[PDB]
Amino acid sequence: MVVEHPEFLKAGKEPGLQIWRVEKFDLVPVPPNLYGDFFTGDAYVILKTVQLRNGNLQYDLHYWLGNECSQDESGAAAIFTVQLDDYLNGRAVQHREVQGFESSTFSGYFKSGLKYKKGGVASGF
Amino acid sequence: VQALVVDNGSGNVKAGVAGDDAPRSVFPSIVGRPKDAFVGDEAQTKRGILTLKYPIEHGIVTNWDDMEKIWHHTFYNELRAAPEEHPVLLTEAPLNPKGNRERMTQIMFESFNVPAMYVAIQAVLSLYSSGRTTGIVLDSGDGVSHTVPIYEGYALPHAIMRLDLAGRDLTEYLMKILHERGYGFSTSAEKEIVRDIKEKLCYIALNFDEEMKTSEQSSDIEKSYELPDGNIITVGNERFRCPEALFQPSFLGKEAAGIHTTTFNSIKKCDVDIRKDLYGNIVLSGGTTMYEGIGERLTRDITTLAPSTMKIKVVAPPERKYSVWIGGSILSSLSTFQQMWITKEEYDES
Ligand SMILES: Nc1ncnc2c1ncn2[C@@H]1O[C@H](COP(=O)(O)OP(=O)(O)OP(=O)(O)O)[C@@H](O)[C@H]1O
Ligand SMILES: [Ca+2]
Ligand SMILES: [Ca+2]
């Protein structure tokens, strides 16, 4: 079986930006009103989908690690990244993003730039 | 249903439940049978009446009957879990032959009747526990050391290096060099004591030749250890000469390349376009990577060997002794794990 998940079924269908937070060993949508603000206590998975001129879709997967996130969260973010790439037939390029050292590509996804906030969802461990 | 996670080490088994941050059970990978069978700590307490055997050699299961005794002990005496009622995640060494994987699978489904199982490569689990999908893991345990390049989640099989130099060789080398000061540690019991001395007092020199110089100039090198019998032993330059063998295997009469050279060689086997990401993500795993000073020393040595355009970063997670098991705990906790395993019914009808 191709490994799937309801969020997997929604991923990469249209050009745009999709952000999930790791919560208790699961991949949970971030409310769109919060896009660009990241909890320092958490880990996130971000899929940027681009419609190329040929019609085809290009995928970049980024996993963002907060300075205070727990090991379950960073480990799950990495694994979910692999799984979502596999779901996309391996055609995503994967990128690790650490708080305060993110790529200019990742920063550029957010018109207001990247911002951080104290707190986060409880660890699953 | 909560999965059980079992890391099958040459030296110790690590076992517990998915979702824990550390294994609840850690015990020696030893089976004793009379001179029916005893496993782990109990086997060592009855070593006087038992012949002791290690069923896992260099990370590979090589005595299947005794390995089944270890797994029985794990489920029934350590965890008190019905194996037939839990999914199980089992680990395997890099480069484990598919035939060995099939044999373990057969035993789990047909001896233990596990309902579902997943087999994971140890080094991959460790990379995940570090929060990475790309890097090169240096996993040095009791019986084997491997360097395992991983790209976007998956090991690159053609680039993995196996090194038959690990912690038990280092314990034996400390036993040997302690004869210089008149100690004669030789029995299996004495070996466990020397293992503890190694873990408590050893360290890796930043520059070996300079450390030899400085340690000769005073007694500041000397540290003391209380033996079980109450006598105190004093160890000097043995403290850093012992793990130096990781870098200089000739110290053990081995012609093998050292861990820095091996890591370099492993990266070189990968195509040029991904090497930067490997050099920048050298992740240490396993008990034999626990020596103070290892990261700084590896960084110097790998920087020397690698092209000077590369950016060398050695990562030394604090809980790296357990990183394989922890990665298994995380993986087996995910919402998607149930789609990854093989079920007993599927296996039985293959
Ligand atoms: N703090 C320490 N310093 C040095 N060596 C250590 C330390 N802690 C454990 N070790 C050594 O690490 C080894 C055990 O490592 P580990 O548990 O990773 O191996 P394993 O999984 O049983 O074996 P393998 O992976 O080789 O099959 C032993 O040789 C032990 O003495
Ligand atoms: Ca959190
Ligand atoms: Ca990919």
Domain ranges (residues) in chain A: 1-125
The resolution, in angstroms to one decimal, equals 1.4
Instruction: Compute the nearest-CA separation of A123 from chain B (Å).
Output: 10
The number of C-alpha atoms within 13 Å of A20 and in the hemisphere containing its C-beta is 28
CA distance, residue B107 to nearest chain A CA (Å): 24
The CATH number of A1-125 is: 3.40.20.10
Residue A43 one-letter amino acid: A
Name the structure determination technique. Answer: X-ray
Check if B137 has its Cβ closer than 6 Å to any atom of ligand 1: no
Q: Rounded to 10 degrees, what is the CA torsion of B128, B136, B24, A119?
A: -40
CATH class of B165-256: alpha beta
Secondary structure class of B309 (helix, strand, coil): coil
Q: Is there an atom of ligand 1 within 6 Å of B199 CB?
A: yes
Q: How far apart are CA B266 and CA B176, in angstroms?
A: 31
Comparing B123-164+257-323 with B165-256, is the CATH topology the same?
Answer: no
List of long-range contacts for A84-91, beta carbons under 8 Å, 24+ apart:
A84/A8, A84/A11, A84/A45, A84/A47, A85/A59, A85/A61, A85/B152, A85/B153, A86/A2, A86/A3, A86/B153, A87/A2, A87/A3, A87/A4, A87/A8, A87/A11, A88/A11, A88/A12, A88/A59, A90/B152, A91/A59
Q: Domain boundaries in chain B?
A: 1-122+324-350, 123-164+257-323, 165-256
Could you tell me which of B196, B287, B188, B186 has the C-alpha nearest to residue B233?
A: B196
Closest residue to A78, CB basis, from B20, B131, B326 = B131
Handedness of CA B3, B7, B12, B14 (dihedral sign): negative
H helical segments located in chain B: 41-45, 64-73, 98-106, 122-129, 167-177, 188-201, 208-216, 238-244, 259-268, 275-279, 294-305, 323-333, 344-349
The single residue listed with the structure tokens 């965890």 is B79
**Chain A residues lying within 8 Å of B153, measured CB to CB:** 79, 81-82, 85-86, 94
- Domain B123-164+257-323, what fold? Nucleotidyltransferase; domain 5 (3.30.420)
The tokens describing A99, both together, are: 């708080």
Fold for B1-122+324-350, please state it: Nucleotidyltransferase; domain 5 (3.30.420)
Task: Please name the helix (run of DSSP H) or strand (run of DSSP E) that holds residue A10, with its range, or none.
Answer: helix A6-10
Instruction: Name the DSSP letter for residue B59.
Output: T
Dist CA A57 CA A89 (whole Å)? 12
Among candidate residues B149, B138, B158, the one with its CA nearest the CA of residue B277: B149
User: Measured between alpha carbons, how far is B86 from B82 in angstroms, rounded to an integer?
Assistant: 7
